[model samples]
Target chain A: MRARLSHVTIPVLDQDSAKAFYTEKLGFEVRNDMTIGELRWLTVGPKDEPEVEMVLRKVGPPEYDEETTAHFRDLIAKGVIGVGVLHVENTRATYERLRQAGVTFVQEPVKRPFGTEAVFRDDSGNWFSLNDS
Target chain B: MRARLSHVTIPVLDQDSAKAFYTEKLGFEVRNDMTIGELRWLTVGPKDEPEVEMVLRKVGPPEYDEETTAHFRDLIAKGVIGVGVLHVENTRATYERLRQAGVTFVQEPVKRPFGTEAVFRDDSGNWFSLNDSRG
Candidate 1:
């Protein structure tokens, strides 16, 4: 059995806000928003690659409490999340596109030791990258 | 303008080992495995789900560096990554299934403040939870 990940789910403080950041700013679209009991099964995917999605669920109780969010916040502070890397054909073009959208960028299009990428912050404190060759 | 997340990706240091932990132990299956220059593209999903996936990639040089890994390790130590969450139709049933698989579990099927879940460690010491109630 090979481990295949269908979705990477994140528990956000607010679902609507997270949806806005991912869809409007990051260029993702709505996929599913079915409510199961108290669970809000909201999912989104890229315009080009809609097969995969980063599931955004409201985080608080029943699923995860304050402790988990605190833990994730710490991980985010350490830069462990790596701004949620996204694939881009042209780093510069994507960079300009994001800049024009009034996104909060962590840095300009700088070529570092790793693949070319630019960083930006979503509505939440999470950071993401637009990377290209 | 909305924030839509289709996947949450983590760059693992080990691929084969990670695959072993996720697929063989945790019940995930390989979705894609290809090569791009120095990149290794691999994706996996549950047997019931072939639509979505958690993108697994090699993180070094082009994608990131040693510094990033170190920082991630620290966050992991702090328990920030929150072990990848998996949806289970029945928490207890899934727990027993995993336990029988010889998976290294952090805890037994115990109900706590949260809905209901059990924790298991991946090959990379990444903690993941099997949550049934978390929407």
Candidate 2:
């Protein structure tokens, strides 16, 4: 009960491509990029939380194995592994700023039960549910 | 990005049980549990990160109809929606602690290219690959 969250693991299509989307365009910092067992372990964290981390995993298996990859590809082709929910104190101001920041929007800022969220995508085609509500 | 990660969304089998696993055993805090459109947005965050958040979504759809739910269940009956990587200062100390804490082990703490990882399973059977690679 005393434990806090340490990290979230996101399966990526390509380490390099995801690297570009998160680090190059979306602006994620590379905390560590290395190999583990039969897989590659790539980690990234938010700039503010030096103690927290997010691992962009290389994924269960690559697409070449068709039989296995197809279903996951169907999901990714639908875009993103999971929605990254961002927060801001002022919903209105942040919404406008994100639009100006070169984010691709599927929907403009709209009020929801949790708050206001804008659907956007990264270079890797992962959709994010940026919210301030 | 000056921003910290707010949350990670995971598709679930049953929101109620996930609510139990996370809150009761995993020790997560429920910041918000409400609805939006056809989807239910159940949010949980670390006990410390009050401002931070993690969304345990009701997911793409339900299993009752088969097709959609079945595949996801095949993955889930495989266990849990996602692996939550946890951090610790001393890998050995924490690994033994987690074991004593009643975590089901898939693997033990072993040093890898990044650092040490201890694979575990949740009540929902979701596998978590805990690591302490970087400072």
Candidate 3:
């Protein structure tokens, strides 16, 4: 089977705010922002990579029940849920820029065995690792 | 910052079984399979896309406590967690091949407004949407 990993869903607390953070702060492009029935299908992608998209999905409703939604919300708020990694051109420089833009960094850029990596949280408290390997 | 979305974490119940499913059934390449302390860092990617990787991460870890791990395991078993999408050359043909390989699919190939799409679960119960828009 010839296949490629395409879209990933990042559970967010709110779509509008998450979209703002992804586009304005992270410099992602709005790939799709459409409404289907009561569900708002919002997706964003890195400006350079158009083939891959990240869906900023809200953690509630049709997909989950009230109990599951609450559990997910709590887990997301704890910052244990890792969204993904963003391969940056320069990790320290990008971290500096994002930090100045009011972005919260849980761990400043540190050199690891793999590469120089840093951790940061989105508006909804989902953490992502920034790596320049 | 010029960046590309690289690795996504797929919470799996078992790394060994999930690796088998991804590599054998889905035809993904094992990008990384190393042990760091107690954590078995296993990752896989599409054979054609080396830049992107999917980490088949076990749910329980130093990252999650016992309570959170239990919650995540339950949710994953219920099939509420979505891993990601896999863009394929042909949706129906790939679905058929995977189904014949003892791969369980929740939704068969159906035409949607976007394209032909199907939903299937990984060995760990995490679901993924398969699309073939280019075809």
Candidate 4:
């Protein structure tokens, strides 16, 4: 089973707002942005990593239970989601740049046992750790 | 600003069970398995793709709000989490291999507008789409 991760789902409140954040703030390339019926299939990823995609899926109203889906979305909006870790060349430098761009930071650059890292939130309130590793 | 996704969180009910399933059934390599304090930072990735890691993080009690964390875990148990998409050379072939290994399938390999794909659930009930680009 030589399987590779192709796409990751990042639940967002709104696809268009999420698209703007990933593309304009994070400098990701818009891999795909198209509508199918009432839903939009939006994706983004780093310019250097074209094969991988981050699916900016809207928080549901899921296909299953409405109550649980709404609860999940509320928790995500409260910043309980640990979206993922973003790898960068220099954590402090990237942190400063993003901070200057008005991106909200949950944690400042710090040297932890793992490595130097910082935390930031997306427009949808999903938190991601920026690590130098 | 030029940040690449290095790791993704896959919330699991139990780290040990998830680790076993991913490594033995899915043929993933253990990238990191370490413990600090009460929690473990276990990670795994494909043998060919060393840079990307899937953190098999245990579902809450998260850093805050135990009730919400428990709720999140419950939803995950119901298979509400869309873990991610896994790329393979052949979707049907990969599905058969994994199925024979006792992996549960949420959807059989079927052709769609996007591509040929099959959905599979992990031991903890988190679903992921397995797709073939050439399909």
The best candidate in terms of TM-score: 3
lDDT of 1 by residue, B61-82 (tens): 5666676656555444443444
Score residue A115 of candidate 3 by CA lDDT: 84
The per-residue C-alpha lDDT of model 2 at residue B124 equals 55
lDDT score, candidate 3, position B77: 90
C-alpha lDDT of residue B10 in model 2:
68
TM-score (chain A only) for the predictions, listed in order:
0.81, 0.73, 0.95, 0.92
Error in Å for residue B63 of model 1: 15
- What TM-score number comes out for model 1? 0.58
What TM-score do all the candidates reach, one by one?
0.58, 0.76, 0.96, 0.95
For residue B15, model 4's alpha carbon misses the true position, in angstroms, by 0.9
Error of 2 at A28 (Å): 2.1
lDDT, residue B41, model 1: 74
Q: Rank the candidates by TM-score, best first.
A: 3, 4, 2, 1
Clashing pairs in 4: none
- What class would a CAPRI assessor give candidate 3's docking? high
Q: Write the per-residue lDDT of candidate 4 for residues A27-94, one digit (tens) a residue.
A: 88898899878678899999778878999988764353688668877878888778889999899998
The positional error of residue B54 in candidate 3, measured at the CA in angstroms, is 0.7
Q: Give the runs in model 3 whose Cα sits over 4 Å from its true position.
A: none
lDDT, candidate 1, A33-107, per-residue tens: 888788887888777564445678665556655766655545444444543556666778877777787777777
lDDT of 3 by residue, A1-133 (tens): 8888889989889999999999889878899999999899999987778888899888988777999899888888988678779998799999988988889988999998878999999998988999988
What lDDT is obtained when candidate 3 is compared to the true structure?
0.88
Stretches off by above 4 angstroms in model 2 are: A36-38, A60-66, A89-103, A111-116, B60-67, B79-81, B88-102, B111-116, B132-135
Model 4 / residue B128 / CA error / Å: 0.7
